[PDB]
Design a protein around this ligand. Structure first.
Ligand SMILES: [Mg+2]
Ligand SMILES: [Mg+2]
Ligand SMILES: [Mg+2]
Lengths: 175, 203, 97, 205
RNA sequence: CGCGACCUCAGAUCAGACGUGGCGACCCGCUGAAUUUAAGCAUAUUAGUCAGCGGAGGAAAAGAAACUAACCAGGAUUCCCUCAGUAACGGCGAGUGAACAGGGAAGAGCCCAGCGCCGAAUCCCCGCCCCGCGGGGCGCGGGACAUGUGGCGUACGGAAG
RNA sequence: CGGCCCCCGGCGCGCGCCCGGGUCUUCCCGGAGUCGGGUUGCUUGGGAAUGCAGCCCAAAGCGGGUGGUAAACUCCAUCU
């Protein structure tokens, strides 16, 4: 639902990946201070979110990811269909978001089909841990039932209306 | 990580998931043209194990081929020869259908060079193949010296000569005791060497 | 007393023992790949010929069950390895319950 | 069409054979052509030897030929490994490498290893500008010739043993006969059968 | 109802490129007879040749083993001499008929997808410049491609840390 | 043989790129409507089917292919 998905993108917004504009200056600030002080470790932890099906699958089956946002409208759906079944087995929480265009704008691209959460900030772990029980209630714990749930198979409205009109005639037959 | 799962999921194409989306789109493919330019590969693992990369210059076409063997194009089934040549209706066309499918893809686009292709659905009448093509004159292809081989002019129209892995299966060549009907060069290059009279000068 | 014909044949030379050529270790299971194929037989399922096979292999008999896999998958030597891996699905479904 | 006592013949001239005829009138014209493809290659290279790299000692297959020694393709990894030289450095030394060859004998393994160390001790390299790692002074006093011929260390050299003279002793003029062939020839073919009758008396109880 | 994204697609005398046809001796992919021979004729032979059709190049095709072998084992392809008119095929008739060792010519090997690893570390296009001839860039700033995966180290002779 | 004019392959100043090898330990390791089987045509010396092609069925992972008489059992060889 969109209230959780807006809270999720609020959390993922400050973990935005590096763009080529800020990649120019980030290699400057590393190099101007190394030219001035030679820092042995200036930044111990730059945190970021990963992107890409082929990168996420490496993180889940190594159990390095902490929450796997997964998209909805992948055109060859077999690119993604294994991944909910796999996050159950490695126990990583996953959530299906609406629209692969919208999480593609997080990573400054068009479509990106998956992102992952590995190292959140420890002061903002408490926002990631807030909605993660709201998520693995809905996806991981329900896996015995969401694997059973068939889809489709409803007739069209011009043909289910004549179903109801036969049932009302059967309802008018009895009383 | 991803593509090993996509491979193994594809290799079971009778299970209820996979035989659904192999025919929810075999319908969708059937409604289009005989050949149609796909914007992106419909199975990106199998394209890239056949030589595809996702950059400017490569292009996929899915094209359609009508299934079945060939009928001998002869008026009223009258072939006018000895009775071993009354073969109107059991004739089988010794080159493959995928090699036919690559052939009428690189024929429409003669500015394009063809690498190879793969299978994306079959109905009872039509059979659908995605054919991958390469523009020899784009600078992402004309640089990158591990790609410069195809822009070298001996590779003009590779399937009309039978050079791709779909098409080279029909020539019957390879090493072995099972394949030395073509043990020099090609099939008729063996025949010319077996049937030449090699009379020397002092004989 | 070495000789050319018989049961101890040939010029008697000494063996060079060595670690085998690497391409001969080709179809091993390599446990990570065992994980991938076993993760995918529960997202995807069984083929329609082999769900009909295990409904003979639990009740009807096995000899008519192998003669069924003899016909659909090709050879005899492929039909037994398919049959004993269906009986191990049928054991893990029933006998681990 | 036949006649008196002669041969019955199958000439294969029932096919249009005048089109596929190959007459060798250019064959002196090509023998003087591929001499020039060797001479203008030999001076083209270097003082590096003509007729290419060094080949192994290789014994032929197929019982008719298994008693002789042939030059092979490449020395291979097992034989390169013991000699100490790297598998990709070996072909700029002048040593051909055939990685698909196997060693399953040890006598022929050590033969090509002895061959390959013998080569390197009669090889002189040229450092570019004279630093010379693993190489010494002036180049073997200008290397005693320039360029070799048709094989470096005479690659066939099919050699046999002397085995001069013995005295015919007892147990040697007594035993190892024709009968030892015929009995060993029979024991190879009655081997699987007699091990089947042996199972039959084991299930006899 | 409007707006934004993305996917699928359109249009244009868009900017910049490309393909077409010829020649066809040799070469590559298919298609393909009959005369003739068998003293007749159907299977066979002629012949996978003639004609038909499509693609190239200065050569093409092949080519680094899902090989040959069966013993003391050879080691990509192509060409020659043999094997050999032989094993085999065939109204077992007419006829047809390869290969492996062996001797030579020539000799040269390699790369990717995948599995992981590196903050996409990669490419195209435009603009002004370092500074240049006969124009191609490594250097600078913008627009795209690209995570549905570009680039690096890697390929079964093992590889990586 | 000489003299003329142009064109070409390769020594040395300035760009560009630049840690390999051995031993051990740990981890990685592969191409699917494909192989294969059926049947049906063609082809081949290839014969209980050498090759190819259609249609149907359709894999495995100490697996797979080959080992020239169909099959079951087994061992070994060889290739990937
Ligand atoms: Mg594009
Ligand atoms: Mg003569
Ligand atoms: Mg030309």
């Amino acid at each position: 639902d969109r209230q959780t998905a807006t809270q999720l993108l609020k959390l993922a917004h400050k973990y935005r990946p590096e763009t080529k504009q800020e990649k120019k200056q980030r290699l400057l600030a590393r190099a101007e201070k190394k030219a001035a002080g030679k820092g042995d470790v200036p930044t111990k932890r730059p945190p970021v979110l990963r992107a890409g099906v082929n990168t996420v699958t490496t993180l889940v089956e190594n159990k390095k990811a902490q929450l796997v946002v997964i998209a909805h409208d992948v055109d060859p759906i077999e690119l993604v269909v294994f991944l909910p079944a796999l996050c159950r087995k490695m126990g990583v929480p996953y959530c299906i978001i609406k629209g692969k265009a919208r999480l593609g704008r997080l990573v400054h691209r068009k479509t990106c089909t998956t992102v992952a959460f590995t190292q959140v900030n420890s002061e903002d772990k408490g926002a990631l841990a807030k909605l993660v029980e709201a998520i693995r209630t809905n996806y991981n714990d329900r896996y015995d039932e969401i694997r059973r749930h068939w889809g489709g198979n409803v007739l069209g409205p011009k043909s289910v209306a004549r179903i109801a009109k036969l049932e009302k005639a059967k309802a008018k037959e009895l009383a | 990580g991803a593509y090993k799962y996509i491979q193994e999921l594809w290799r079971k194409k009778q299970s209820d998931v996979m035989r659904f989306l192999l025919r929810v789109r075999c319908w969708q493919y059937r409604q289009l043209s005989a050949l149609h330019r796909a914007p992106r590969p419909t199975r990106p693992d199998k394209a890239r194990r056949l030589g595809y990369k996702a950059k400017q210059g490569y292009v996929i076409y899915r094209i359609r081929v009508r299934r079945g063997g060939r009928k001998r194009p002869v008026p009223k089934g009258a072939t006018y020869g000895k009775p071993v040549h009354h073969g109107v209706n059991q004739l089988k066309f010794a080159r493959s259908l995928q090699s036919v499918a690559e052939e009428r893809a690189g024929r429409h686009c003669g500015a394009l060079r063809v690498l190879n292709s793969y299978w994306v659905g079959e109905d009872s009448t039509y059979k659908f193949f995605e054919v991958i093509l390469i523009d020899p004159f784009h600078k992402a292809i004309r640089r990158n010296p591990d790609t410069q081989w195809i822009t070298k002019p001996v590779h003009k129209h590779r399937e009309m000569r039978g050079l791709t892995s779909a098409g080279r299966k029909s020539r019957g060549l390879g090493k072995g005791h099972k394949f030395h009907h073509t043990i020099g060069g090609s099939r008729r290059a063996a025949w010319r060497r077996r049937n030449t009279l090699q009379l020397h000068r002092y004989r | 007393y070495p000789m050319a014909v018989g049961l101890n044949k040939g010029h008697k030379v000494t063996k060079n023992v060595s670690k085998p050529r690497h391409s001969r270790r080709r179809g091993r299971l390599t446990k990570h790949t065992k994980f991938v194929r076993d993760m995918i037989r529960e997202v995807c399922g069984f083929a329609p010929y082999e769900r009909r096979a295990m409904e003979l292999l639990k009740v009807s008999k096995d000899k008519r069950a192998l003669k069924f896999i003899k016909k659909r998958v090709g050879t005899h030597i492929r039909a037994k390895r398919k049959r004993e891996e269906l009986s191990n699905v049928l054991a893990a479904m029933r006998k681990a319950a | 069409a036949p006649s008196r006592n002669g041969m019955v013949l199958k000439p294969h001239f029932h096919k249009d054979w005048q089109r596929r005829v190959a007459t060798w009138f250019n064959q002196p014209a090509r023998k003087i052509r591929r001499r020039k493809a060797r001479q203008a290659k030999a001076r083209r290279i270097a003082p590096r030897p003509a007729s290419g790299p060094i080949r192994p000692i290789v014994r032929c297959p197929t019982v008719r030929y298994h008693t002789k020694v042939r030059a092979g393709r490449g020395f291979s990894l097992e034989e390169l490994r013991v000699a100490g030289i790297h598998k990709k450095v070996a072909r700029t030394i002048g040593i051909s490498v055939d990685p698909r060859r196997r060693n399953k004998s040890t006598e022929s393994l050590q033969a090509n290893v002895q061959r390959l160390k013998e080569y390197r001790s009669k090889l002189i390299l040229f450092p570019r500008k004279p630093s010379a790692p693993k190489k010494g002074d002036s180049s073997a006093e200008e290397l005693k010739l320039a360029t070799q011929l048709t094989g470096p260390v005479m690659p066939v050299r099919n050699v046999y043993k002397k085995e001069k003279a013995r005295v015919i002793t007892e147990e040697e003029k007594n035993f190892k006969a024709f009968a030892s062939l015929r009995m060993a020839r029979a024991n190879a073919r009655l081997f699987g059968i007699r091990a089947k009758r042996a199972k039959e008396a084991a299930e006899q109880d």
